[PDB]
Amino acid sequence: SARDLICAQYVAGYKVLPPLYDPYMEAAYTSSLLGSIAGASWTAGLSSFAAIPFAQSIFYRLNGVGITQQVLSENQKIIANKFNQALGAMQTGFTTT
Amino acid sequence: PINSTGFVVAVPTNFTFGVTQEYIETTIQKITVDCKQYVCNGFKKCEELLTEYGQFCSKINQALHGANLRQDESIANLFSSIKTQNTQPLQAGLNGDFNLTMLQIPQVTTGERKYRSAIEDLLFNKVTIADPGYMQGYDECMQQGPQSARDLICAQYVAGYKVLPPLYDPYMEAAYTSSLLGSIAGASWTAGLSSFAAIPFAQSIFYRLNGVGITQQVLSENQKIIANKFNQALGAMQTGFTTTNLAFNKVQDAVNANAMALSKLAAELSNTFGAISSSISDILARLDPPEQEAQIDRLINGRLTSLNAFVAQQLVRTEAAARSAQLAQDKVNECVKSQSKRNGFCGTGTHIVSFAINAPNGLYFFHVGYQPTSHVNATAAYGLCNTENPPKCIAPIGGYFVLNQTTSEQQWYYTGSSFFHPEPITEVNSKYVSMDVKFENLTNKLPPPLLSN
Amino acid sequence: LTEYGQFCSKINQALHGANLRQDESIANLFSSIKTQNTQPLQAGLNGDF
Amino acid sequence: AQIDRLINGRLTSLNAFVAQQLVRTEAAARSAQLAQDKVNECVKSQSKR
Amino acid sequence: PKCIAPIGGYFVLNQTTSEQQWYYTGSSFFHPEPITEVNSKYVS
Amino acid sequence: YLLNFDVEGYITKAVDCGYDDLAQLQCSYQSFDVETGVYSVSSFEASP
Amino acid sequence: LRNQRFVYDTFDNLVGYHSYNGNYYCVRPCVSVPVSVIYDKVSNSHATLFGSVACSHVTTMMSQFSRMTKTNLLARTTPGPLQTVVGCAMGFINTSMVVDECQLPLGQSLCAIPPNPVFQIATLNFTSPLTLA
Ligand SMILES: *[C@@H]1O[C@H](CO)[C@@H](O[C@@H]2O[C@H](CO)[C@@H](O[C@@H]3O[C@H](CO[C@H]4O[C@H](CO[C@H]5O[C@H](CO)[C@@H](O)[C@H](O)[C@@H]5O)[C@@H](O)[C@H](O[C@H]5O[C@H](CO)[C@@H](O)[C@H](O)[C@@H]5O[C@H]5O[C@H](CO)[C@@H](O)[C@H](O)[C@@H]5O)[C@@H]4O)[C@@H](O)[C@H](O[C@H]4O[C@H](CO)[C@@H](O)[C@H](O)[C@@H]4O[C@@H]4O[C@H](CO)[C@@H](O)[C@H](O)[C@H]4NC(C)=O)[C@@H]3O)[C@H](O)[C@H]2NC(C)=O)[C@H](O)[C@H]1NC(C)=O
Ligand SMILES: *[C@@H]1O[C@H](CO)[C@@H](O[C@@H]2O[C@H](CO)[C@@H](O)[C@H](O)[C@H]2NC(C)=O)[C@H](O)[C@H]1NC(C)=O
Ligand SMILES: *[C@@H]1O[C@H](CO)[C@@H](O[C@@H]2O[C@H](CO)[C@@H](O)[C@H](O)[C@H]2NC(C)=O)[C@H](O)[C@H]1NC(C)=O
Ligand SMILES: *[C@@H]1O[C@H](CO)[C@@H](O[C@@H]2O[C@H](CO)[C@@H](O)[C@H](O)[C@H]2NC(C)=O)[C@H](O)[C@H]1NC(C)=O
Ligand SMILES: *[C@@H]1O[C@H](CO)[C@@H](O[C@@H]2O[C@H](CO)[C@@H](O)[C@H](O)[C@H]2NC(C)=O)[C@H](O)[C@H]1NC(C)=O
Ligand SMILES: *[C@@H]1O[C@H](CO)[C@@H](O[C@@H]2O[C@H](CO)[C@@H](O)[C@H](O)[C@H]2NC(C)=O)[C@H](O)[C@H]1NC(C)=O
Ligand SMILES: *[C@@H]1O[C@H](CO)[C@@H](O[C@@H]2O[C@H](CO)[C@@H](O)[C@H](O)[C@H]2NC(C)=O)[C@H](O)[C@H]1NC(C)=O
Ligand SMILES: *[C@@H]1O[C@H](CO)[C@@H](O)[C@H](O)[C@H]1NC(C)=O
Ligand SMILES: *[C@@H]1O[C@H](CO)[C@@H](O)[C@H](O)[C@H]1NC(C)=O
Ligand SMILES: *[C@@H]1O[C@H](CO)[C@@H](O)[C@H](O)[C@H]1NC(C)=O
């Protein structure tokens, strides 16, 4: 019953075409996105690439929204722990709700 | 990432101008159908039988009329910008050192004014479109005889449908495109839209280049090279109308779709739909009234199904054309009349300037972007400060603090983000910031901003 | 079936065009891989994150 | 007559399938463009919106 | 007169509820700190 | 003919479809009241 | 084309015939000429446009049209047919007026001006606000 839809291809006379790219290409795309998040923030162009670490990029992003450098220096570990808690909480967020 | 202090950044050393082509549709072909003639072909017996399916023809006419009215409103809204767009006259051929000859409409001393530019003439000659006999099509279809390439147009007076002319003649479209070309130049450092500055095209281009990370010294040194590269980029797209160009292919796809709708509408009248014949006259001649009704009803049902399908798809294409027209307005306002800070919206790379020309059933865009070709690995610093009881740390503005090399006593310079050219650090290209742990401590060599004079 | 016109050919052409458009659309999205500069990330921990 | 009734029913089914398939293709193309915009704005940079 | 305005923040008093002392704080976190030329600019 | 019935069930006005073009427009769209615009109309006049 | 008395288009419509007399005749359905009506609600006036038809042919082909159209065509009235770029029109007078807004468009940058409570053919031309050199 769960497979009759697929096996109806060779009786009804229709074909399901495979996708253009295999999942390995999609994995390469997602890995490409993850490796381009870090970068400069005070530049006014898109022609230069800076190899800034992820932590420094996150702290630069936080400083640009209204958080001073002194607060970031004092609350570095707390910010890191809160980010880790936020990322880990979404592993069990795949529910019907 | 490097293991020392600071960070490594790739700064371009050579560049070229890349052109991205995009086609956006704005309108579709407006079609009106004579439902009574299409279904019954003037036979009273058919018309008597058609009443049993309700007021079909009136609903068809109202739906088509509403669709055409909406398309007219949509195209009228797009062209209204001409009335309230400030423009300045451009020079003929050369504006400084940039060559804009192909984008302009050639002036004629005597005769009729032209409504197509050189690039538009090249684009239109590569697309085959039938002439839909706006003025004398009815007579021409009789004087010329049956032709395969023209049967779709001449089927108007046999099948019973009409192709409406567009709202504006091509001269209005030429005026619109010329209006767009004359509004590109303007100010860049203002924070409003209520003032118009008559800045020449060359100065506007150089101001746009200076805002993306290119210093004034580099622009002054490489003025002729930049102009030559821009001219080469503009001239290379004259021969870019080939089958390999996807954007050019979509124009032919739109034309083919317009042809296909009328081909589907015309071909359905030759089907019998299971009846003894596709002609009402043959049915009346070969059969008697007790048996004629069934065959006539089969033909009626087939033709009603055809008309409903045509109306549904026509409404779909009208709505898609309206949304695409809104997209075109947004593209014009963002890419053509100003410089875009977004990524991927006005072509690839760092956007500089865009041009728009007339295209069949839409507009054609040429996005010019700054495309680097070579890079250098440069050592950079987050900030610099001296060693005092109160520290004063500085940060670069629109650039990087880099060492003058391609691979305690280090000398720091400033460079633009879009071109590698070290220059001394002054208060022009630096600002004071708070103390940071990752900033370099300059023991001996201090720029003037860091000197406690 | 011939009395209803060239039904099957039109069906095949429409489906083929739709599949071709979808292939072009998905190809355009994935083209960014060729010209996206990237840097290697660390395994597990990048600083404290 | 009976064969014609079956033919008409199956032609109607095929036309409905083709129409809905084209609808979903167009919606998927627009959604793909939205995904590209979301990636460029939210993933590879920080959004002020 | 020479009037100044905050940059990316507010000029606030150091309290949760002629001799008032003004400080600077970030817009996204409350942490008063002395006003300098780094976090201020001259205005009309 | 195009007939209009009032609230009491009587015919108050009528249109001869084949008389002129305005009547043809009214019978083509089946409405006595038509908004301002340009419309394509059918033929309702029969000849020997 | 060949030794055939009947000419058919791609869609199997009979379009041409060779007769015994020796003439060749074009074959069209009894309703072939497109007809469009321009109506103004305020003044309750209307006009007729024959799209893509030369004025001279409209005079010969009258059987398709309504009774009043037939009478007006036969009467050879002063406001009679006028050839435009979108076909032959009846009930219009040619004017050199230029307008920037239209409520009764006719295509190809043509506009119809309703009479104050015949129609006038106007043209849509837009003007830039100002030019700064
Ligand atoms: C306010 O805004 C107003 C509206 O925008 C504006 O008025 C307009 O002014 C312009 C410019 O002055 C006028 O354009 C001209 O129109 C002429 C007539 O066009 C019609 O007829 C032709 C057929 O000719 C027959 O009929 C005419 C009378 O109508 C008669 O004079 C002639 O002898 C013939 O009997 C027909 O072809 C036209 O339709 C086609 O073109 C349209 C676009 O122009 C299309 O929209 C339409 O679909 C048709 O398209 C098809 O055909 C063309 C041509 O083959 C193909 O390109 C296309 O793909 C498609 O197949 C229309 O029904 C027209 O004759 C005239 O032509 C000259 O100028 C143009 C542009 O420079 C050249 O391309 C032509 O070759 C020709 O150039 C030279 O002209 C001189 C002087 O006339 C001649 O001596 C030369 O011989 C000739 N050279 C050659 C090689 O032929 C031009 O298009 C327009 O009609 C006006 N519109 C109105 C009044 O409504 C007004 O000025 C504005 N006001 C202000 C103040 O700004
Ligand atoms: C940027 O690249 C271009 C293209 O390669 C370089 O142009 C070359 O210039 C040299 C002289 O310096 C000529 O001999 C070559 O023929 C040119 N190459 C061409 C036209 O392809 C240009 O010099 C480079 N700019 C730099 C390195 O600053
Ligand atoms: C600007 O570009 C135009 C073409 O867009 C050049 O005009 C061409 O010049 C050549 C060489 O004389 C001629 O053979 C062509 O016929 C011209 N094409 C035209 C007029 O469309 C023009 O020379 C360029 N300007 C400069 C200053 O180089
Ligand atoms: C940065 O270093 C470059 C070389 O790496 C310097 O360019 C040289 O400058 C000297 C002195 O004027 C010239 O003799 C050389 O010909 C230059 N070389 C090249 C390849 O152009 C440059 O001046 C330095 N920039 C500074 C110190 O600001
Ligand atoms: C410049 O000197 C300062 C001294 O104030 C250095 O700041 C120290 O940085 C280390 C980590 O590198 C911290 O653990 C210390 O607490 C900091 N000291 C103080 C007094 O705040 C700074 O690192 C130096 N910059 C460099 C080496 O690039
Ligand atoms: C702003 O006021 C707060 C209290 O409202 C000050 O924080 C106190 O500072 C004193 C003096 O260093 C410490 O003894 C207290 O423990 C601090 N209290 C808390 C709750 O942290 C703060 O220093 C003031 N900020 C200024 C003057 O810039
Ligand atoms: C009649 O209408 C035309 C437009 O179709 C008006 O324009 C003239 O058109 C003729 C024929 O094409 C040209 O030779 C003239 O040069 C046009 N004149 C102008 C000023 O554009 C024409 O003026 C109208 N006649 C009237 C109102 O009497
Ligand atoms: C029948 O349905 C049940 C319940 O969904 C499922 O577990 C079972 O595998 C199905 N049987 C077959 C033969 O598909
Ligand atoms: C027939 O088709 C050919 C090839 O496309 C074309 O060249 C020719 O003009 C056509 N003939 C007619 C009469 O349309
Ligand atoms: C400004 O100059 C333009 C011509 O460039 C002229 O038409 C306009 O009247 C002038 N405006 C004023 C306010 O003097």
Side-chain angles (χ1 to χ4, degrees), chain A residues 1-76 78-91 93-95 97, chain B residues 1-2 5-24 26-47 49-72 74-83 85-86 88-106 111 113-127 129-143 145-223 225-238 240-242 244-290 292 294-318 320-386 388 390-405 410-442 445-451, chain C residues 1-23 25-34 36-37 39-49, chain D residues 1-25 27-49, chain E residues 1-15 20-44, chain F residues 1-7 9-46 48, chain G residues 6-9 11 13-18 20-42 44-55 57-76 79-95 97-100 102-115 117-126 129 132-133:
Chain A
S1 181
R3 310 271 293 110
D4 272 355
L5 211 52
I6 299 300
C7 300
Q9 292 177 92
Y10 321 112
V11 181
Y14 60 91
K15 183 60 172 54
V16 176
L17 302 183
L20 177 60
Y21 298 118
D22 65 329
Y24 295 88
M25 174 73 73
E26 303 174 345
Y29 176 81
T30 42
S31 71
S32 177
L33 296 188
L34 188 60
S36 67
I37 288 184
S41 62
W42 62 91
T43 59
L46 303 173
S47 60
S48 62
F49 179 73
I52 296 184
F54 180 82
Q56 275 65 73
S57 301
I58 293 299
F59 286 134
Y60 267 108
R61 290 165 176 252
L62 286 173
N63 186 248
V65 304
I67 306 180
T68 59
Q69 231 294 314
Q70 191 165 341
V71 178
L72 294 174
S73 298
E74 296 183 350
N75 301 73
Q76 189 190 149
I78 289 89
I79 288 178
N81 291 336
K82 289 180 174 178
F83 193 89
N84 289 335
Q85 294 187 3
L87 249 59
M90 66 188 205
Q91 303 185 13
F94 296 139
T95 58
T97 76
Chain B
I2 59 183
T5 55
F7 60 95
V8 52
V9 53
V11 186
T13 56
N14 208 347
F15 70 97
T16 187
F17 288 113
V19 181
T20 303
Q21 303 183 15
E22 178 184 10
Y23 167 72
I24 299 177
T26 55
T27 50
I28 69 178
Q29 197 164 55
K30 294 179 298 186
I31 310 298
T32 54
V33 177
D34 190 0
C35 165
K36 178 185 181 181
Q37 167 64 24
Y38 184 87
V39 172
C40 285
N41 196 17
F43 289 89
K44 242 74 175 184
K45 179 68 238 181
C46 171
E47 298 162 25
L49 294 174
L50 185 57
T51 62
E52 310 306 312
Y53 296 85
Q55 300 175 337
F56 180 85
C57 285
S58 60
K59 288 192 284 294
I60 295 298
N61 293 326
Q62 295 164 219
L64 289 181
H65 185 267
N68 294 336
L69 218 56
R70 280 190 299 272
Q71 174 149 289
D72 279 331
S74 179
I75 186 58
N77 175 263
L78 179 63
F79 273 61
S80 62
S81 61
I82 305 176
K83 296 164 132 52
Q85 179 52 233
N86 295 132
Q88 71 163 7
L90 286 180
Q91 302 299 306
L94 286 185
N95 291 254
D97 297 318
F98 305 93
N99 191 4
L100 304 177
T101 303
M102 26 154 293
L103 288 175
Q104 296 168 305
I105 295 177
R113 47 157 177 165
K114 318 185 76 170
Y115 58 94
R116 292 263 154 84
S117 63
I119 186 66
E120 289 189 353
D121 281 321
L122 294 178
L123 178 58
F124 269 86
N125 291 338
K126 294 287 194 306
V127 184
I129 305 177
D131 187 10
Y134 287 147
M135 195 180 198
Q136 294 181 301
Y138 187 88
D139 312 78
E140 282 169 318
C141 281
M142 302 195 319
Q143 317 299 341
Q147 299 178 5
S148 181
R150 310 271 293 110
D151 272 355
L152 211 52
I153 299 300
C154 300
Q156 292 177 92
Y157 321 112
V158 181
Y161 60 91
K162 183 60 172 54
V163 176
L164 302 183
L167 177 60
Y168 298 118
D169 65 329
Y171 295 88
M172 174 73 73
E173 303 174 345
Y176 176 81
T177 42
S178 71
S179 177
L180 296 188
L181 188 60
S183 67
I184 288 184
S188 62
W189 62 91
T190 59
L193 303 173
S194 59
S195 62
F196 179 73
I199 296 184
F201 180 82
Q203 275 65 73
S204 301
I205 293 299
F206 286 134
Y207 267 108
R208 290 165 176 252
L209 286 173
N210 186 248
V212 304
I214 306 180
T215 59
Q216 231 294 314
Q217 191 165 341
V218 178
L219 294 174
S220 298
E221 296 183 350
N222 301 73
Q223 189 190 149
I225 289 89
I226 288 178
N228 291 336
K229 289 180 174 178
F230 193 89
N231 289 335
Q232 294 187 3
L234 249 59
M237 66 188 205
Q238 303 185 13
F241 296 139
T242 58
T244 76
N245 196 346
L246 309 188
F248 176 75
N249 290 335
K250 292 194 174 179
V251 182
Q252 192 65 64
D253 284 18
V255 175
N256 293 340
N258 283 333
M260 168 146 287
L262 297 180
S263 289
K264 288 204 193 304
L265 194 57
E268 284 283 302
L269 286 183
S270 63
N271 298 336
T272 66
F273 303 107
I276 66 176
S277 179
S278 62
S279 177
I280 302 184
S281 60
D282 285 357
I283 297 184
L284 298 179
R286 301 176 188 180
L287 290 180
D288 269 286
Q292 292 169 349
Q295 308 292 305
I296 300 183
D297 188 77
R298 288 172 84 92
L299 286 185
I300 289 181
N301 275 280
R303 299 179 178 169
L304 294 194
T305 300
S306 177
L307 279 182
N308 284 332
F310 175 79
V311 169
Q313 64 93 39
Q314 204 73 5
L315 295 177
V316 161
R317 304 203 297 118
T318 295
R323 283 185 285 103
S324 185
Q326 181 56 58
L327 177 60
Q329 176 75 90
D330 299 334
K331 292 272 184 172
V332 166
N333 284 333
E334 169 142 22
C335 317
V336 177
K337 297 178 181 175
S338 59
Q339 188 178 15
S340 177
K341 298 179 177 299
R342 286 205 278 175
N343 180 25
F345 180 81
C346 308
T348 65
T350 306
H351 174 256
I352 302 301
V353 68
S354 297
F355 304 99
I357 68 175
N358 282 316
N361 301 313
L363 293 168
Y364 208 84
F365 286 87
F366 298 102
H367 303 292
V368 181
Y370 180 88
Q371 186 57 245
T373 57
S374 62
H375 281 96
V376 61
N377 296 340
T379 302
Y382 295 98
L384 308 171
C385 353
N386 47 23
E388 299 176 353
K392 301 209 309 300
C393 292
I394 60 181
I397 302 181
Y400 304 101
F401 287 157
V402 301
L403 303 173
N404 186 13
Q405 60 189 221
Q410 296 172 326
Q411 175 70 237
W412 291 99
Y413 297 94
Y414 170 82
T415 184
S417 61
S418 300
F419 198 90
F420 188 79
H421 180 81
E423 49 203 42
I425 301 177
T426 61
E427 95 275 14
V428 173
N429 53 42
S430 62
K431 63 172 183 180
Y432 295 102
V433 292
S434 303
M435 171 53 132
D436 198 353
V437 68
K438 51 176 177 301
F439 286 175
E440 311 273 355
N441 294 308
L442 303 184
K445 302 197 171 189
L446 288 170
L450 297 187
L451 285 178
Chain C
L1 185 57
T2 62
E3 310 306 312
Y4 296 85
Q6 300 175 337
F7 180 85
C8 285
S9 60
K10 288 192 284 294
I11 295 298
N12 293 326
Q13 295 164 219
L15 289 181
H16 185 267
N19 294 336
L20 218 56
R21 280 190 299 272
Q22 174 149 289
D23 279 331
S25 179
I26 186 58
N28 175 263
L29 179 63
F30 273 61
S31 62
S32 62
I33 305 176
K34 296 164 132 52
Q36 179 52 233
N37 295 132
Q39 71 163 7
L41 287 180
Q42 302 299 306
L45 286 185
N46 291 254
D48 297 318
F49 305 93
Chain D
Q2 308 292 305
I3 300 183
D4 188 77
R5 288 172 84 92
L6 286 185
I7 289 181
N8 275 280
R10 299 179 178 169
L11 294 194
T12 300
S13 177
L14 279 182
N15 284 332
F17 175 79
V18 169
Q20 64 93 39
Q21 204 73 5
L22 295 177
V23 161
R24 304 203 297 118
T25 295
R30 283 185 285 103
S31 185
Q33 181 56 58
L34 177 59
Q36 176 75 90
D37 299 334
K38 292 272 184 172
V39 166
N40 284 333
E41 169 142 22
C42 317
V43 177
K44 297 178 181 175
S45 59
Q46 188 178 15
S47 177
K48 298 179 177 299
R49 286 205 278 175
Chain E
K2 301 210 309 300
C3 292
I4 60 181
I7 302 181
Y10 304 101
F11 287 157
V12 301
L13 303 173
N14 186 13
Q15 60 189 221
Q20 296 172 325
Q21 175 70 237
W22 291 99
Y23 297 94
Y24 170 82
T25 184
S27 61
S28 300
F29 198 90
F30 188 79
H31 180 81
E33 49 203 42
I35 301 177
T36 61
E37 95 275 14
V38 174
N39 53 42
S40 62
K41 63 171 183 180
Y42 295 102
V43 292
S44 303
Chain F
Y1 250 62
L2 191 65
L3 306 176
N4 179 264
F5 297 87
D6 71 331
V7 76
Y10 297 108
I11 306 177
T12 49
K13 51 182 177 178
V15 167
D16 185 11
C17 297
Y19 181 64
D20 56 351
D21 288 11
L22 178 57
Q24 286 191 145
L25 162 65
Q26 292 174 294
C27 296
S28 298
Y29 289 78
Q30 294 224 25
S31 182
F32 281 79
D33 314 314
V34 50
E35 314 282 48
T36 301
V38 183
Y39 308 84
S40 59
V41 306
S42 301
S43 299
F44 296 89
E45 181 65 25
Chain G
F6 299 91
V7 185
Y8 295 91
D9 61 357
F11 309 106
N13 298 294
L14 178 63
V15 297
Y17 179 70
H18 304 85
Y20 278 145
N21 51 18
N23 314 12
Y24 176 80
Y25 299 99
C26 286
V27 183
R28 293 297 182 271
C30 298
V31 179
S32 61
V33 173
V35 177
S36 61
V37 178
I38 299 93
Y39 173 77
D40 173 59
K41 185 191 222 303
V42 174
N44 197 68
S45 58
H46 75 275
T48 298
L49 167 64
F50 304 100
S52 301
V53 197
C55 289
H57 199 168
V58 173
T59 305
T60 67
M61 293 181 54
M62 304 195 321
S63 59
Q64 176 187 323
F65 304 153
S66 61
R67 314 195 206 96
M68 285 299 103
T69 305
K70 287 165 173 178
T71 302
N72 293 331
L73 285 174
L74 277 171
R76 328 216 77 83
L82 172 65
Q83 181 65 55
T84 69
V85 295
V86 296
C88 191
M90 261 178 53
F92 293 88
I93 55 173
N94 179 19
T95 68
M97 307 188 349
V98 168
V99 297
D100 72 322
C102 186
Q103 203 186 4
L104 290 166
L106 302 177
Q108 301 294 274
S109 300
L110 286 182
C111 188
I113 308 301
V118 307
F119 285 75
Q120 310 196 83
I121 296 186
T123 316
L124 283 163
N125 300 79
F126 293 168
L132 190 58

